[PDB]
Design an enzyme around this catalytic site. Structure first.
Site, PDB file in Angstrom:
ATOM      1  N   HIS A  58      -8.660 -15.865   5.928  1.00  0.00           N
ATOM      2  CA  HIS A  58      -8.248 -15.187   4.681  1.00  0.00           C
ATOM      3  C   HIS A  58      -8.355 -16.164   3.534  1.00  0.00           C
ATOM      4  O   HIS A  58      -7.840 -17.326   3.609  1.00  0.00           O
ATOM      5  CB  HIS A  58      -6.839 -14.606   4.837  1.00  0.00           C
TER       6      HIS A  58
ATOM      7  N   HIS B  60       0.802  -1.202   0.000  1.00  0.00           N
ATOM      8  CA  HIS B  60       0.000   0.000   0.000  1.00  0.00           C
ATOM      9  C   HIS B  60       0.849   1.274   0.000  1.00  0.00           C
ATOM     10  O   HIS B  60       2.050   1.291   0.347  1.00  0.00           O
ATOM     11  CB  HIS B  60      -0.965   0.089   1.212  1.00  0.00           C
TER      12      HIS B  60
END
Ligand SMILES: [Mg+2]
EC number: 5.1.2.1
Lengths: 418, 417
Positions: free
Chosen positions: A166, A100
Site C-alpha cells: 500500500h 465507505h
C-alpha cells in the site's frame, strides 16, 4: 522486447527495443488447506479455538464489498475454529467499511453467499453514526480514537483480511481492520492528515517509522484485537498463503512474505513506463496515483513517468480533481494541502497531495481513454493516445536515447532503489 | 343486491336480484401493542422472558414466503422478550418451509427486512435434507416423526405464526409450525395421506376428531414446542389480535376467536357464488380449491358452485393437473387417490383429492383468465368469462329460479349448516 501492459479489460502490446531498456521490473495445496495450516500454526498466540473457549460475545471483523478478501472460504473456517471448543458461541461478523458507504444486501450476497449472510450475524460498520462509536483512547500522535461499540463490547475480537503493498500505509491488512476499518469518519480522515502523508516513511512497503502505521498499531492494541487471519492472494483472487495469530506478529510474517514477492530493485532512469494493473485497479485517475508512485521511485528527478491506466470511470473524485483544477501548478497544490492541520483533513486530499509530490519532481504522461484527456491536462499531466505517442512525448522532454525502466504492473510492486 | 367479488388485484361488481339470494355470508390498540399485550399476558405458561432465562440455545420457528405473518413487527418483539433476562441467548430463527421449496434471500428481505436478515441468524428448513432430520417418536396414527435437528437440539423451542381457517387442518398456526413446518418430507407426505384427507373431520374450522390435527398436536408435544406467539390479521395483513403462551392452549384461544369472527351459517342453496379472496391467494387453480370448499359447504348436493379466481399462474402444479388429465372423471381420480396408503402420498395428491371430492357431488364454474380455460375443462369444470356468464351456465344446469348463496371471500370463512 514485446512488453504486455495491463490496461482496462485488455493488455496493451508494445514493442520496445531492448537497447532502450534499463530493466523490466516485475514482481515474482487447496485454498482451504492453506487457511487451515495458518489457523493450526498461529504466530505469537494460542489457537483461535483456545482463545474462543468460554467466551460469550465474539466479533470477527471482515472486509467490505470493495476488498477482494475471499470470505466464502475464510469465514467458515474461522467460524468452525471458533466453535471447536465453544459450539454455542455467539459470533458477530462486523463489516469494516471504513469511510465507505454501507455494503448493501446484494453486495453482501455476492461477497459472502446467501446461506452465510442468512445463517450468521452480520453487522455493517457505519463510521458516520456517532451513537455506535466509542472513544477508547488517545493515539501516539495525540488524536482521539473512536471505534465501533460492538468491537469494544466483545469478549474476543478477531479480524480477517489480506496483505498487499500500500502506497502510504506500507501494506494492507492486520491493524487496518481497526483503523480505518471500524473507526469514526473523523478518526479516519485524521489518519490521512497532510503531516502524516508528508512523512518520508509513509511509502509503499514501509512500516517502521511510518506514523500512519504507528497510529494504526496503537489503535489495534487499544481495541484488544486478539487474533487475525490474513491471506495473500494472486491476481485471480486465489489464496496462495495465509498467516494467523497475533495481530502484529502474524501481519508482519505476511508482510515479510509479500515483500519477498513484490520487491523490485530499480536503477533510476530518465523514463519509466508502468500501468495501474488493469481493470478494476485502473478504473480512475485517483487510483492511478498508486502506479505512479512505483514510477516515481524508479525515475530520476525531472524524468518522465508514462502510466497506462484506462480510467474508464474518469477522475475518481471531484475534490481530488478540484485541487488541481483550482491551483496554479503542482507546488501550489502541495502548499495548500500542507497548510491543513491534523483535524482539517478532507476527503480525497491525501491522493492529491501524493500526486502533487510526484508532479513537482517529474512529468507524468497518461495513456488513457480519450474521455479523460481534458482531466489529465487540467491535472498538470499530458495525455497520450498510446504508448508510442507517450514515448515520443517523453523523448522530446528528456532524450531519444534515454534508457527506460519498464514496470508492467505498477500497483503490485514495491520499488526499491538499487 | 350489489355484490363485490375479489378477483386478482381487484373486485368484480355484479348486481343480483334479492329474490334469488338465499344469504350473503361474510366474516365480521396499535399492532405493536397488541403483540406486546399477548406476550405480557401469556396463556397457560409463564412469560417467554422467564422461559428463556438460563437457556443458551433458542430457536424461533417462523413462517415461510407463502404466509403473510407480519414478522417485521413480531420478530423484534419476540427477540426482545427472549433477551430480557438473557442478553447472550443464542437465537436462531428457523423458517418453516414445510413441503415448499426454500425461501430466497429476496423473499427474506421482503418479509423480514435487510437489517434483521443480516443481523440475526436465519436458517431455512429443508424437508429433503435427510441428514438434518431426526427421528423423535411415532405418531398416534402409527407413522414415524422426524423433524429438523436444530429444533430437537434447542434448549427452548418457540414458534410464531398466524391463525385463520384451514380447509383440512381446521385452522392454521400453533402445532402446524412443527408438522409439517419443520418435518421431514416423508412425514409431511404421510400427514397429507388419502386416509387422513378423506376423514369427515378433516375440514375447515374443525379440530376435534380431525386426525391431521391429532398427529400435529402429538408432534408439537414430542418436539417440546414450549411457547407460541400467533397473531390474527385482517384482510390488509394488519394485526387485530394476538395470543401467546402454551402451544395448545394459546392456539385454542386464538381459534375460538377466529371461529367467532369467521363462522357463517348457510342454508344449502342450489347455487353458490364465491372467490378465493383475490391476489395473491387466487394465483392458480391449486389454491382455488380452498375457496371451493366454502362453496361446497353452502351448496346442496348436485348444485353449482361458481368461484371467481384469476389463476394467472395457471393450474398451480403439474402433479396436481396430471391427476385429472390422466383420469376419466372425478370419481376415477378419487378411486386412484384412495387406493394409496399412508406412505404412498404423491406430491400435491391432497389438493387433487379435495377437488375430486367436490366435483363428485357438485358442478364447479370458474371465472378465470382466458389462458386457463383448457386447464379448467381438463379438470372437469366449466370456465366462464365474468359472473353474468357463470350464472347463465349455472341456471342451465339447475333451475332459472334457483336460490343463490353469496360468499364474497371463500377463504376467510368457516361455513356452518
Ligand atoms: Mg443473518
Amino acid at each position: 522486447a514485446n512488453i504486455e501492459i495491463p490496461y482496462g479489460k485488455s493488455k496493451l502490446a508494445f514493442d520496445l527495443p531492448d537497447e532502450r531498456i534499463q530493466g523490466i521490473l516485475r514482481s515474482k495445496m487447496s485454498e482451504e488447506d492453506i487457511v487451515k495450516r495458518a489457523l493450526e500454526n498461529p504466530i505469537g498466540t494460542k489457537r483461535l479455538q483456545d482463545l474462543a473457549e468460554g467466551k460469550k460475545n465474539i466479533v470477527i471483523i471482515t472486509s467490505d464489498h470493495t476488498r477482494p478478501v475471499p470470505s466464502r472460504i475464510t469465514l467458515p473456517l474461522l467460524l468452525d475454529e471458533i466453535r471447536k471448543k465453544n459450539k454455542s458461541a455467539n459470533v458477530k461478523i462486523l463489516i469494516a467499511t471504513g469511510f465507505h458507504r454501507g455494503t448493501t444486501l446484494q453486495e453482501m450476497k455476492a461477497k459472502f453467499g446467501e446461506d452465510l449472510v442468512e445463517n450468521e450475524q452480520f453487522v455493517v460498520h457505519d463510521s458516520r453514526n456517532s451513537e455506535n462509536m466509542e472513544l477508547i483512547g488517545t493515539l501516539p500522535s495525540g488524536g482521539k480514537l473512536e471505534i465501533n461499540k460492538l468491537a469494544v463490547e466483545a469478549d474476543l475480537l478477531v479480524a480477517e483480511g489480506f496483505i498487499e503493498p500500500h502506497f502510504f500505509a506500507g501494506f494492507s491488512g492486520g491493524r487496518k481492520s481497526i483503523l480505518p476499518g471500524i473507526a469514526s469518519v473523523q478518526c479516519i480522515l485524521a489518519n490521512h492528515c497532510s503531516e502524516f502523508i508528508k512523512n518520508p516513511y509513509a511509502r509503499t512497503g514501509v512500516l517502521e517509522n511510518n506514523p500512519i502505521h504507528r497510529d494504526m498499531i496503537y489503535a489495534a492494541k487499544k481495541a484488544n484485537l486478539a487474533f487475525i487471519l490474513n491471506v495473500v492472494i494472486d491476481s485471480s483472487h486465489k489464496i496462495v498463503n495465509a498467516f494467523a495469530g497475533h495481530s502484529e506478529k502474524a501481519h508482519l510474517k505476511g508482510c515479510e512474505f509479500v515483500s519477498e514477492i513484490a520487491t523490485v530493485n530499480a536503477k533510476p532512469a530518465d523514463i519509466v513506463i508502468t500501468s495501474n494493473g488493469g481493470y478494476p485497479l485502473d478504473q480512475n485517475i485517483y487510483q492511478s496515483v498508486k502506479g505512479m508512485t512505483a514510477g516515481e521511485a524508479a525515475c530520476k528527478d525531472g524524468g518522465v513517468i508514462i502510466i497506462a491506466a484506462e480510467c474508464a470511470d474518469g477522475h475518481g473524485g471531484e475534490g481530488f480533481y478540484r485541487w488541481f483544477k483550482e491551483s496554479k501548478d503542482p507546488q501550489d497544490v502541495m502548499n495548500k494541502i500542507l497548510s491543513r492541520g491534523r483535524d482539517e483533513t478532507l476527503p480525497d486530499q491525501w491522493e492529491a497531495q501524493i500526486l502533487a509530490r510526484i508532479l513537482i519532481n517529474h512529468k507524468v504522461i497518461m495513456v488513457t481513454d480519450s474521455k479523460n484527456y481534458e482531466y489529465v491536462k487540467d491535472m498538470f499531466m499530458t495525455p497520450a493516445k498510446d504508448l508510442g505517442e507517450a514515448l515520443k512525448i517523453a523523448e522530446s522532454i528528456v532524450n531519444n536515447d534515454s534508457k527506460i525502466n519498464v514496470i508492467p504492473d505498477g500497483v503490485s510492486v514495491i520499488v526499491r532503489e538499487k
